């Protein structure tokens, strides 16, 4: 089921990540997407980077033309991407999303991450980005629109711009128990706006982005101990600890398998000890970890 956004919205508390990488051939986002749908995901994540606007928006189109959901049931999130932050450019390309998607709203529109490129690093007050966000809300193009990679500083920039008009429902960022961002979600809560959690499951681990020496998540000693306690598998316990921490979280799956296990989140609980040794496992690490962005000027994990 659903939270309450902080404007009036309500999004699904688990959603279904369809990143994958480019070898990936592009018609398979369109049958996990289905599958997604199917298995019972009503919370769908998206973007113009992930060059898979098309194949979902058709996955969503699809399932409502045989009646399986109707568009409303649907929440749908795309993101704007960073070489777009001139706020000039933000409501063309939220038009684009949606002709690729062939939709005509998308529930969400985030700000992708706060490292503006040349539309090659680009700097830009994030501040008049926000602006043309809501000017997105007012024409119906978005119902809600929020932010992800901010930390509390960045997101502090936009609550505290002069003439502010709507808060960021959310903040998605990466949050799994390697990094938790415990402080960042007791700041979030404060405001009232919801962080999403990504790579909850431990990331898709491509070399472009992650040290292959990084711990692998979902081989995790303590949340092995939980599955086995549970006889659930150590992804469950992995997306089940968010939930119960007020977090809305995604998952990515492109097996039809994990797809439809998944959704089993909603199946069981974790006890406070169970919750205690989870929070035990923060160690700080982002599996993003490049210097293809640890160097720009609006990194976020230099604070
Ligand atoms: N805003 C941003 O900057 C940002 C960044 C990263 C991610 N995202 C969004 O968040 C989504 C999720 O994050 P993510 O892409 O990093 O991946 P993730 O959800 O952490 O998943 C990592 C891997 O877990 C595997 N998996 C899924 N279910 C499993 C299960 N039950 N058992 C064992 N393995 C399981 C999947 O592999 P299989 O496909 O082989 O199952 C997936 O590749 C993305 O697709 C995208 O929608 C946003
Ligand atoms: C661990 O997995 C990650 C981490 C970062 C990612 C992505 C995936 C994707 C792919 C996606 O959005 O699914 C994008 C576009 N990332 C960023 O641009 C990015 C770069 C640096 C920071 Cl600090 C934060 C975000």
Same mark, same amino acid.
């Given at each position: ?82 070489? @777009? ?5 933000? !409501? ?9 998607? /062939? ?17 090659? @690093? ?12 809501? &000017? ?17 500083? /960045? ?23 390697? @990094? ?6 007791? @700041?979030?809560?404060? &405001? ?14 491509? &070399? ?19 599955? &086995? ?15 119960? !921490? ?11 398998? !994990?797809? !439809? ?43």
């Amino acid at each position: 089921q659903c939270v309450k956004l902080n404007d009036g919205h309500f999004m699904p508390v688990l959603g279904f990540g369809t990143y994958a990488p480019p070898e990936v051939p592009r018609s398979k986002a369109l049958e996990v997407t289905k599958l997604a749908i199917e298995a019972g995901f009503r919370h769908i994540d998206s973007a113009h980077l992930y060059n898979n606007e098309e194949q979902v928006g058709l996955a969503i189109r699809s399932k409502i033309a045989d009646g399986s959901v109707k568009r409303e049931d649907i929440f749908y999130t795309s993101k704007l991407w960073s070489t @777009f932050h001139r706020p000039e450019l933000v !409501r063309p390309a939220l038009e684009n999303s949606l002709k690729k998607a /062939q939709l005509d709203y998308v529930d969400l529109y985030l700000i992708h991450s706060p490292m503006s490129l040349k539309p090659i @690093f680009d700097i830009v007050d994030l501040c008049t980005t926000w602006e043309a966000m809501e &000017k997105c809300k007012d024409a119906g193009l978005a119902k809600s629109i929020g932010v992800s990679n901010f930390n509390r500083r /960045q997101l502090e920039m936009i609550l505290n711009k002069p003439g502010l008009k709507y808060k960021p429902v959310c903040n998605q960022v990466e949050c799994h128990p390697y @990094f938790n961002r415990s402080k960042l979600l007791d @700041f979030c809560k404060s &405001k009232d706006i919801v962080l999403v959690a990504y790579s909850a499951l431990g990331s898709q681990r491509d &070399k472009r982005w992650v040290d292959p020496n990084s711990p692998v998540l979902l081989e995790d000693p303590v949340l092995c101990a939980l599955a &086995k306690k549970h006889k659930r598998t150590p992804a469950l316990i992995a997306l089940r600890y968010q939930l119960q !921490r007020g977090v809305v979280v995604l998952a990515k799956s492109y097996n039809e398998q !994990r797809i !439809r296990q998944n959704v089993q989140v909603f199946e069981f609980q974790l006890t406070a000890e169970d919750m205690k040794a989870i929070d035990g496992l923060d160690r700080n690490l982002h599996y993003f970890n490049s210097d293809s962005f640890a160097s720009h000027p609006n990194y976020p994990y230099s604070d």
